[PDB]
Amino acid sequence: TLTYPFHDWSQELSPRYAQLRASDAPVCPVVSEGTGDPLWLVTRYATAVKLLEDSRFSSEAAIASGAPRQEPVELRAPGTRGDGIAMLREAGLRSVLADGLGPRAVRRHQGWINDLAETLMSELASREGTFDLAADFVEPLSSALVSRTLLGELSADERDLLAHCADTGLRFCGVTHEEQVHAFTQMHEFFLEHARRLAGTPGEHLLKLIAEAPVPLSDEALAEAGSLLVVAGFPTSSGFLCGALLTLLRHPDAVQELHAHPERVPSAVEELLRYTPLSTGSVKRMATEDLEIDGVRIKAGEVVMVSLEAVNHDPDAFEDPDVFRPGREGPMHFGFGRGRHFCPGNRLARCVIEATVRAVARRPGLRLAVAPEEISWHEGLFFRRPRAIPATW
Ligand code: HEM
Ligand SMILES: O=C1N[C@@H](Cc2c[nH]c3ccccc23)C(=O)N2CCC[C@@H]12
Ligand SMILES: O=C1N[C@@H](Cc2c[nH]c3ccccc23)C(=O)N2CCC[C@@H]12
Ligand SMILES: [Ca+2]
Ligand SMILES: [Cl-]
Ligand code: NA
Ligand code: NA
């Protein structure tokens, strides 16, 4: 049986996804390379909609300790719950999450986000020679997003510790199992020592809103909130922004169009979310009872995966799916998922993506300083990221 994942750590998607999509079944059996667990895999848009909109396929049951899984180790510090955003929703914090992640948070932060994107790009444009868009643009912008909107102000050393923990824990391979587990322990212990300090600093970052919310969360619960915000917000935003910059630098005609027609930038943001691959794994859900999807029986307790990259490149949903085409008129993309677990970070993500696209579109001529095939990729990360993006004007 086919093992999962497909080791497509660069922007070139594994051919397996299109092979399975065109096969004679709407759901295909695979086996986790890291655990040996049997799993089901969906690659078609129409089938993915039905799965992800059926609440009898549960995300929490697939997150839970002991579930069949695609990842080699559990994504939690041993002895903690590690059950994700469910822990905060269950504590009654939906309103707080809306305040800290929703349109009001974007209104509060979009000004400094755009000012920072411009400041960073202006500094790079002042340099003689090449620079690295990953280290010199994405890292400072994503780190500021995390500090100012999610956690509170971090030192460089704290940011480096959390980034290392995320990169070490959120992996299919490349580190030992024990190193991966200990990354989660280190992050949890960091927040046990520092979450209350971070939550008490001035600002409106989400961790402060959580800590102050009238249910009072314990130190352990606040630490779990910190770890959630790191894993959900940091490697995702950094990986995506790097990947979106590569897409843009490889499509100078599209950038020129955005330079001339800034009103088209939002359409380019949405097309980047469809076109630019991020996760090398899949969203997943556990059948909470015996279910059927397009004729295939899924037994209670079995886990079904949807590859968002596969769905976003489904030719039955998008005409010429492998073409970057801002303004294409097709269905909604799956870059933020689908259904009740749709990314609650989507407003802040779109804000930072838009700020980046506009910073690039204002400065035509930005190009890669090496060929795309010369970009080196971190191998095995859940969320693709290049080691560097050499660039120049
Ligand atoms: C920047 C690019 C981002 C992308 C492309 C992205 C994408 C996604 C996707 C596809 C999901 C759905 C997973 C599933 O269905 O199981 C998701 C969930 C989630 N995202 Fe985002 N995300 C991004 C940024 C962020 C940020 C900045 C935050 C927080 C500040 C965040 C917080 C979350 C949380 C907490 C969930 C879990 C939702 C749930 O399980 O109900 N995301 N994200
Ligand atoms: O809140 C959650 N939701 C799902 C999807 C996910 C969203 N962002 C993630 C980042 C890494 C892994 C999985 C996800 C999950 O697997 N979870 C374990 C870590 C965070 C938790
Ligand atoms: O690679 C992963 N993706 C997320 C889902 C996701 C898909 N695309 C995303 C984009 C952003 C956040 C989460 C996702 C998830 O549930 N995982 C369990 C173990 C592997 C890890
Ligand atoms: Ca195509
Ligand atoms: Cl089990
Ligand atoms: Na459908
Ligand atoms: Na719901």
Author numbering: 3 to 217, 221 to 398
Article passage:
Further, the in vitro assay confirmed that NasF5053 could produce NAS-C (47.4%), Asp-A (44.4%), as well as a minor product NAS-B (8.2%) (trace I). Our systematic mutagenesis studies on the promiscuous NasF5053 and the versatile NascB identified four key resides, Q65, A86, S284, and V288, which play critical roles in controlling product regio-configurations and stereo-configurations.
On the other hand, the single mutations Q65I and A86G in NasF5053 dramatically reduced the production of NAS-C (trace IV). Furthermore, the double mutation A86G-Q65I almost abolished the production of NAS-C, leaving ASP-A as the only detectable product (trace VI). These results clearly indicate that Q65 and A86 are the two crucial residues in NasF5053 that that direct the enzyme to produce NAS-C. Comparisons among the three substrate-bound structures showed that all substrate-interacting residues, the heme, and the two substrates superimpose well (RMSD in this region between any two structures <0.26 Å), except for the mutated residues and the adjacent residues such as K289 and I87. The plotting of the spectral variation as a function of cWL-PL concentration is fitting to a rectangular hyperbola curve, yielding a binding constant of 11.6 ± 2.1 µM for the interaction between cWL-PL and wild-type NasF5053, 25.6 ± 1.0 µM for cWL-PL with NasF5053-Q65I-A86G and 4.81 ± 0.26 µM for cWL-PL with NasF5053-S284A-V288A. The Q65-A86 patch is involved in regulating the motion of the long loop αB’-αC, where Q65 and A86 reside at its two ends. The Q65I and A86G mutations result in a shift of the αB’-αC loop away from cWL-PL-U radical. The consequent relaxation of the restraints on Int1 unfolds Int1 (the distance between N10 and C2 is approximately 4.7 Å in most distance distributions). The results exclude the intramolecular cyclization of the cWL-PL-U radical to form a pyrroloindoline, without affecting the formation of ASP-A; this observation is consistent with our data that NasF5053-Q65I-A86G exclusively produce Asp-A.
